[PDB]
Design an enzyme around this catalytic site. Structure first.
Site, PDB file in Angstrom:
ATOM      1  CG  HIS A  93      -2.035   0.982   1.100  1.00  0.00           C
ATOM      2  ND1 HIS A  93      -1.861   2.339   1.303  1.00  0.00           N
ATOM      3  CD2 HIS A  93      -3.325   0.816   0.740  1.00  0.00           C
ATOM      4  CE1 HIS A  93      -3.001   2.958   1.068  1.00  0.00           C
ATOM      5  NE2 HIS A  93      -3.907   2.062   0.723  1.00  0.00           N
ATOM      6  CD  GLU A  95      -2.586   5.469   3.569  1.00  0.00           C
ATOM      7  OE1 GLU A  95      -2.904   4.485   4.278  1.00  0.00           O
ATOM      8  OE2 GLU A  95      -3.422   6.183   2.980  1.00  0.00           O
ATOM      9  CD  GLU A 163      -2.356   2.075  -3.248  1.00  0.00           C
ATOM     10  OE1 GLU A 163      -1.110   1.976  -3.261  1.00  0.00           O
ATOM     11  OE2 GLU A 163      -3.001   2.200  -2.184  1.00  0.00           O
ATOM     12  N   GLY A 169      -4.951  13.303  -3.238  1.00  0.00           N
ATOM     13  CA  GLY A 169      -4.617  14.511  -2.518  1.00  0.00           C
ATOM     14  C   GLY A 169      -3.790  15.514  -3.306  1.00  0.00           C
ATOM     15  CB  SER A 209     -10.953   9.242  -4.342  1.00  0.00           C
ATOM     16  OG  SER A 209      -9.723   9.808  -3.930  1.00  0.00           O
ATOM     17  CG  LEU A 228      -7.732  -1.216  -1.145  1.00  0.00           C
ATOM     18  CD1 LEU A 228      -8.198  -2.476  -0.417  1.00  0.00           C
ATOM     19  CD2 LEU A 228      -6.226  -1.221  -1.338  1.00  0.00           C
ATOM     20  N   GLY A 230     -11.189   3.304   0.650  1.00  0.00           N
ATOM     21  CA  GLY A 230     -10.619   3.924   1.828  1.00  0.00           C
ATOM     22  C   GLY A 230     -11.686   4.442   2.769  1.00  0.00           C
ATOM     23  CG  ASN A 231     -11.223   8.295   4.662  1.00  0.00           C
ATOM     24  OD1 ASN A 231     -11.016   8.004   5.845  1.00  0.00           O
ATOM     25  ND2 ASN A 231     -10.348   8.977   3.926  1.00  0.00           N
TER      26      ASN A 231
HETATM   27  O1  LIG Z   1      -7.219   1.945   0.043  1.00  0.00           O
HETATM   28  C1  LIG Z   1      -7.254   2.920   0.192  1.00  0.00           C
HETATM   29  C2  LIG Z   1      -7.076   4.255  -0.306  1.00  0.00           C
HETATM   30  O2  LIG Z   1      -5.915   5.085  -0.546  1.00  0.00           O
HETATM   31  C3  LIG Z   1      -8.254   5.461  -0.226  1.00  0.00           C
HETATM   32  O3  LIG Z   1      -8.474   6.447  -0.106  1.00  0.00           O
HETATM   33  P1  LIG Z   1      -9.680   7.252   0.654  1.00  0.00           P
HETATM   34  O4  LIG Z   1      -9.182   7.489   2.068  1.00  0.00           O
HETATM   35  O5  LIG Z   1      -9.890   8.541  -0.142  1.00  0.00           O
HETATM   36  O6  LIG Z   1     -10.883   6.329   0.611  1.00  0.00           O
END
Ligand SMILES: O=C[C@H](O)COP(=O)(O)O
Ligand SMILES: O=C[C@H](O)COP(=O)(O)O
Lengths: 246, 246
Positions: A93, A95, A163, A169, A209, A228, A230-231
């Site tokens: 990932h 991050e 990704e 961002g 996103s 996948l 995220g938020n």
């Molecule tokens: O898997 C995950 C992601 O980088 C998602 O991003 P997000 O926080 O905008 O849903």
């Protein structure tokens, strides 16, 4: 190919917010034989989450060690994951590549350790903005996949995730067409390194996103097999996203 | 000051092995009000271990994030640990500094995050063989402690651990006296940067190789308040090491 929808809760949740979120999720009717739906909670919440979710949902952890068992304080090994029957692990990932220096070598080692221990892996990769502006998207994506694709023995057990960092961002938005172009290319790479049959059976998820507004338009693309999230996976409306893949 | 004995299982364990090791630990009759005994299992083993261990024992996690809640895939935040009633976190262990590129800098942020969320911290530091052969021990220690000493608000909640890297895995041995001299020096640094009352109440554990055959010799040194046991904490004989401290 079976669609795949994964909720990556990242570093979020409390015992109470999870209890409330899992209840909502359990209300959604779906056939696990026709759709894979995986939830990835924080490690200390794994067990709590697994007991709250109905067996129709799959679960997994956000990271596994490249080492086995032993003197590696803070790490969770594939062997340990296997003993708990943890089905999926997320690897590479962005991050983790960004904040915790994970390299393509690490990604490779972790996928190897995961497969050896019968864990299914969700592997992430993608190019950044600077890289996309230099028109090196294809080149970067090729070099990231080729770092681990020879390890893939079984194409139902490894899921790829694209990704678009260049759209995370940075204020630029990725269009469904733009996602599709990259996904088609990724599948080509898999095709000309693993085989045409292999390439048509591996799932490639979009990991930018994703929300309730753009999911249907993304999932409808030929080479996008799921997400996948995220938020958006931290909300009750997540069930709507799952439905777009049903 | 109250002795502190901790078991760092690192990356080891199966559901069965823990269910066998904990039954052996529970047989020990000791008063939690006079001695602190903490067990740190792998994160995914937390709930299981907390349920099997009698409340005499405290529990915690081997690492915590320097970030808070948010988009940090695979990280466990301090507030998440708090919501789970996790009491202790290990910070700055040499395996995390060595294999994962954690700096004194990440140490200070993790300690700040932990205190900020009312967690008790076990902070690790120590010099390498190359820094010792060059008489650099004190300089190195002083820099590592300075990186975070000012954050310590309550000196009963932060436990210091001296890891003699030079005598860990090198094939070299650390005599209790040689350990006592470093601890005495560490306690002087606390005294001169925080105050005399502060230095007298803070525990400084020996975190080198500890076993049943040398634990008594070490705990007897006046500036060594206990230990962070590794491998030995994975054996039932670990109760003997706990006894040496009561
Ligand atoms: O898997 C995950 C992601 O980088 C998602 O991003 P997000 O926080 O905008 O849903
Ligand atoms: O805290 C832990 C240590 O580095 C221990 O070492 P060990 O594996 O020899 O017990």
């Amino acid at each position: 190919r079976k669609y795949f929808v994964a909720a990556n809760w990242k570093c979020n949740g409390t015992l109470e917010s999870i209890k409330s979120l899992t209840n909502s999720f359990n209300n959604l009717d779906f056939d696990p034989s026709k759709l894979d739906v995986v939830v990835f909670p924080v490690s200390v919440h794994y067990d709590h989450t697994r007991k709250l979710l109905q067996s129709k949902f799959s679960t997994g952890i956000q990271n596994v060690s490249k080492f086995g068992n032993g003197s590696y304080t803070g790490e969770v090994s594939a062997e340990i994951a296997k003993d708990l029957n943890i089905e999926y692990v997320i690897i590479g990932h962005f991050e983790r590549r960004k904040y915790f220096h994970e390299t393509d070598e690490d990604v490779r080692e972790k996928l190897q350790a995961s497969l050896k221990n019968n864990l299914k892996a969700v592997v992430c990769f993608g190019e950044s903005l600077e890289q996309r502006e230099q028109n090196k998207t294809i080149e970067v994506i090729t070099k990231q996949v080729k770092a681990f694709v020879d390890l893939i023995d079984n194409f139902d057990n490894v899921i790829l995730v694209y990704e678009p960092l260049w759209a995370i961002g940075t204020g630029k938005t990725a269009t469904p067409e733009q996602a599709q172009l990259v996904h088609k290319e990724i599948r080509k790479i898999v095709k000309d390194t693993c085989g045409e049959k292999q390439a048509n059976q591996i799932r490639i998820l979009y990991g930018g996103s994703v929300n309730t507004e753009n999911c249907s338009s993304l999932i409808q693309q030929e080479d996008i097999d799921g997400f996948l999230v995220g938020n958006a996976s931290l909300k009750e409306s997540f069930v709507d996203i799952i439905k777009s893949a049903m």
